[PDB]
Design a protein around this nucleic acid. Structure first.
Lengths: 209, 114, 145, 66
RNA sequence: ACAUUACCGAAGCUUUGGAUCUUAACGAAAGUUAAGAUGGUAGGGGAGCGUUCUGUAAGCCAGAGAAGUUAAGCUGGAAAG
RNA sequence: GUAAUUUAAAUGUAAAUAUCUUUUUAAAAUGUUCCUGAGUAGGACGAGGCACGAGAAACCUUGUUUGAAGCUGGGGAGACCACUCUCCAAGGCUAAAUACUAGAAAGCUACCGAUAGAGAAGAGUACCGUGAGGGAAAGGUGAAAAGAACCCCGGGAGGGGAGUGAAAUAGAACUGAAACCGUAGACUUACAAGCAGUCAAAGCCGUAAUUUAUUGCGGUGAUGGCGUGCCUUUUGCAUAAUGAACCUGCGAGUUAUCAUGUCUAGCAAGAUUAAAGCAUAGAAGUGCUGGAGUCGAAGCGAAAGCGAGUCUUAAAAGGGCGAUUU
RNA sequence: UAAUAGAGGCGAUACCAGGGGAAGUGAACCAUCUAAGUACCCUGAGGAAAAGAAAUCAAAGAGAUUCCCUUAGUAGUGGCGA
């Protein structure tokens, strides 16, 4: 597909081609759903824990005799029924991470990129620039010239431009991503998506393969 | 991930107590007795909703039989003549008629005796 | 707001059990009334309640002869026809790179499912009589390695 | 790998699986006193058989991998 | 006891209003009609309500009054809202 | 405080440089002799460890006994023998990768928020036992004490006023329910045998409409009809079978892996990486690298072995298990 | 007796090495076996320890020791019962 390219001051400068095999695949909402689930599960620490009968402090003496007292039978003081006792079938530390098939992950990336690029206004492309001073004023000015939907803004880069990345690490609702380190959740929930043409070309050969 | 917030049991109990307002003794405030009495009450309500039809029809029949005690028509024979002369009026209607306007009912009976 | 829109049937819920009468899985929770099974247990050992089990009534048959098998990959004439062409040497290297076998095994055998039409050269370890007859008839060459 | 299901070795040594479900086995009663048994009986006991379809599910539980 | 005409009498039958499901027909489909079929423990299958946290959410609603019990009223076929 | 930077007099821990210490102050090169680890190798009996329970039972350690060779050698190659291929014991050291965190510092959490969380937000204290030892319960005023000057009742406590405060039904305590105990008002009840409810229903009271005392929303209810609390367990329970003083909190099919079935997603005669590495980040990520391995693609036969056939057999002669239609 | 040198004990309700070594269970009994070198006891030090440079693996051509992924629930063993 064809796409207009705006200059860094908000005005049009040129035109670029978005390859169809990446930005115009038929959407696979199933792959998008699976990928989002996986990316957010892999982010869990999953270190919550709890003590069973055997880990609560206390003795394992029978509190009173089996028969004759007139009370309900009991084995140990830290019985899960008793107050302060252990916890039956509580949470234990566990590994929540898993790895999706790479083909499904790739298809999800293609689908989310196509879904975002389908809309002309929310997706935009800007000619290559850099913040040589590293300040934040300049970057913020560029976003606030482009972005319109008052919300999450995701910038895509074609390299690791450390100046831009550490100039944008502090913007309010900004996420800077390189082409080869994409995250489906950020792409899917981004209400403004601003890409460089370097990022466009690197994405083309990155996902055509 | 502890999921404790106990704004549920109080809700169940408040609805039950709201429906069990006028009951005698401890059945109006205690949760256990109120729930037992309410649940048997609702079952009674269903049964009785079906029974009210029988009760009212029995009342209507007795009222008709009373309004006919004057004349010499036993109301089995009255129903007889009613059907035979093809008057498809209703037990409720006849019972109410014998009270609101006795002379119309009496005329119906004269007409049945044929 | 973008509404992920999960595909239907992509995640069954669960069989949460013992959580009320109305759920159908109430007090007894799917276990029945009483007995051994109502309390966590079932005697596993293929058990028939003390009757001599089937795997103890029946007799045995012999060794497995593992540790001495000559195990090695099967390749069929139909596969060769579908994948190759004239003049090259069907052997370990070419079948491996063309993904007809895996390079764990190096003692291929050639079987005769499907038909082969192309004159080829073979460097294999075993060959069935029917397959080598058909292959000599089509006009190939066979070296046993 | 912490908890791989163990096969039941005494069952492995007696059962075998065919390609599409059936279970092959060796018949009993041909191991011991054999003079009295009729020749046709012995000949039938020699040849191997297949189990009834009622045991196949339990056997598939006993042999989780084979 | 034997005759004549009856009536009463169940959640049965019939009729009225409403809902779900199966089958069939119509309809592009949605659905609209016709037929019947829905007591139910064990137990099997299927469809939902509600609680807490997480992403959505640097969103929205709150000191001009959040959350929570608390009086009354109302809606949904049930969980309830 | 946080980002990126950055304080070291003194002390502690690290390398690098010399100093210092030590060593070679030489090697390529043929055959005769010497030595090359001795109660040791091995064997007999009794045991243990090797996955391997005497089994054909190697091999290693080892208790009781016995007992060698000296490179022209010896050990091992799962009884043993021969050949062959490897290795050279019976002397002594060795960092790293690996196990562990009582703790120290810097951080994180689909971890907890006072019956939770360490037993312990106050602690192994109070208390119990001769001792070993066992073992609790108790968090919250207000934004700030700005802790109610003074006055009245009372011995005080406490309350009523006056003041502080946005609030004093905020005054040693936030939000303050249920169980429980009350006060006041309305209605009903002392001729009656009510699982306390439901279906009808006069009268009284509250209230809205209809010009106004007859219809509804309501609370009480004379009287009539029906009705053996619930849970669990049994062929079968109101049963005089079992269980609960009430109320409020706490209080049970979970997690990790394997087998198998189904659903969803993806690829396809192929599918898929595990460990682990690199890069960026500091962001227990996720993008690559990594195909060793596993499951299909040919099965049959105890196996050798043969193969769309194989086995049973002289026999496809008939069948058993397959398939050509995955 | 003299001379110096190294140790005594505590700490880690952790880890490692050596010695001693059960019982509740499963096998629906039990006596083999299993649990299991598990708990625990005792002797030693370390920050890691132990082990560590082949009279070895093993029929492949490799080359110290240790820790992972696979091989693999495979090869064998087992009142061939578990």
């Amino acid at each position: 597909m064809e796409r207009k390219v705006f200059s860094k001051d908000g005005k049009e400068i040129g035109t670029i081609n978005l390859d169809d095999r990446v930005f115009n695949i038929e959407i696979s909402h199933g792959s998008i759903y699976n990928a989002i689930k996986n990316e957010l599960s892999n982010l869990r620490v999953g270190t919550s824990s709890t003590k069973t009968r055997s880990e609560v402090r206390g003795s394992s003496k029978k509190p009173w005799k089996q028969k004759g007292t007139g009370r309900a039978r009991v084995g140990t003081k830290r019985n899960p029924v008793w107050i302060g006792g252990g916890i039956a079938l509580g949470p234990k530390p566990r590994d929540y991470s898993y790895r999706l098939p790479k083909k499904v992950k790739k298809l999800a990336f293609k689908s989310v990129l196509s879904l975002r690029a389908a809309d002309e206004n929310s997706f935009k492309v800007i000619e290559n620039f850099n913040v040589e001073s590293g300040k934040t004023k300049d970057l913020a000015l560029i976003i606030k010239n482009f972005a319109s939907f008052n919300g999450k803004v995701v910038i895509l880069l074609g390299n690791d431009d450390q100046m831009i990345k550490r100039a944008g690490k502090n913007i309010r609702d900004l996420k800077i991503l390189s082409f080869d380190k994409l995250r489906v959740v950020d792409l899917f929930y981004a209400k403004n998506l601003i890409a460089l043409e370097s990022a466009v070309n690197k994405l083309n050969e990155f996902y055509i393969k | 991930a502890r999921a404790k917030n106990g704004t549920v049991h109080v809700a169940r109990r408040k609805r039950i107590l709201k429906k069990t307002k006028g009951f005698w003794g401890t059945k109006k405030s205690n949760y256990k007795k109120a729930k037992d009495t309410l649940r048997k009450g609702m079952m009674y309500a269903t049964r009785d909703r079906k029974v009210r039809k029988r009760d009212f029809r029995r009342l209507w029949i007795s009222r008709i039989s009373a309004a006919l005690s004057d004349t010499g028509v036993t109301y089995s024979r009255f129903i007889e003549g009613l059907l035979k002369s093809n008057i498809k009026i209703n037990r409720k209607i006849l019972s109410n008629l014998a009270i609101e306007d006795v002379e119309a009912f009496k005329k119906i009976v004269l007409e049945i005796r044929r | 707001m973008f509404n992920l829109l999960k595909p239907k049937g992509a995640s069954k819920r669960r069989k949460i059990v013992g959580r009320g009468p109305g759920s159908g899985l109430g007090k007894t929770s799917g276990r029945g009334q009483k007995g051994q099974k109502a309390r966590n247990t079932s005697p596993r050992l293929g058990f028939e309640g003390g009757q001599t089990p089937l795997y103890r009534r029946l007799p045995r048959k012999g060794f497995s002869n593992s540790d001495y098998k000559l195990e090695y990959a099967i390749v069929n004439l139909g596969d060769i026809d579908k994948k190759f062409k004239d003049g090259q040497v069907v052997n370990y290297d070419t079948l491996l790179e063309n993904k007809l076998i895996k390079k764990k095994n190096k003692k291929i055998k050639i079987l005769s499912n499907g038909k082969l039409t192309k004159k080829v050269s073979f460097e294999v370890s075993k060959i069935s009589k029917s397959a080598e007859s058909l292959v000599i008839k089509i006009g190939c060459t066979i070296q046993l390695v | 790998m912490a908890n791989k299901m163990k096969t039941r070795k005494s069952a492995k040594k007696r059962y075998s699986f065919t390609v599409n479900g059936k279970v092959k086995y060796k018949k009993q009663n041909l191991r011991h006193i054999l003079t009295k048994k009729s020749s046709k009986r012995k000949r039938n006991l020699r040849k191997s058989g297949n189990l009834s379809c009622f045991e196949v599910k339990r056997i598939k539980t006993l042999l989780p991998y084979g």
